[PDB]
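## Example record

The block below lists the input lines for one assembly entry, exactly as stored, with component labels intact.
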Amino acid sequence: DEAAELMQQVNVLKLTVEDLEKERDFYFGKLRNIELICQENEGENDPVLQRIVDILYATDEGFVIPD
Amino acid sequence: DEAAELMQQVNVLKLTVEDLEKERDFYFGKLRNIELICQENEGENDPVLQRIVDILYAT
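Predicted structure tokens for the full assembly:
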């Protein structure tokens, strides 16, 4: 029964999607919290923060949904 | 046709898994890059890096 087999596969993939969404969003949230820390401490010429800002750049929201 | 409908749903959910997983991995890798920078600069007693370390390991 192909329909039954596919329904089981759908249920499993849905759980996987829910889990991955949470994981993605949790890591993204960490990146955003770190971006905030950098933005707050902006213009104090800390070279390590500059390193971190440069890493952060590609993870910016504007590359996912235009802002 | 339930089987055909479900098959399309599987295809979409596989693509969704792929997209979410790749995104998760990319964000993880970036966090790990930041982690290393923090580790390398530990014992400088930089309070901003302490803030960042605390975010990294928050649950």
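Chain A touches chain B through 31 residues (CB under 8 Å). Residues 1-67 of chain A form a domain with the Single alpha-helices involved in coiled-coils or other helix-helix interfaces fold (CATH 1.20.5.1430).
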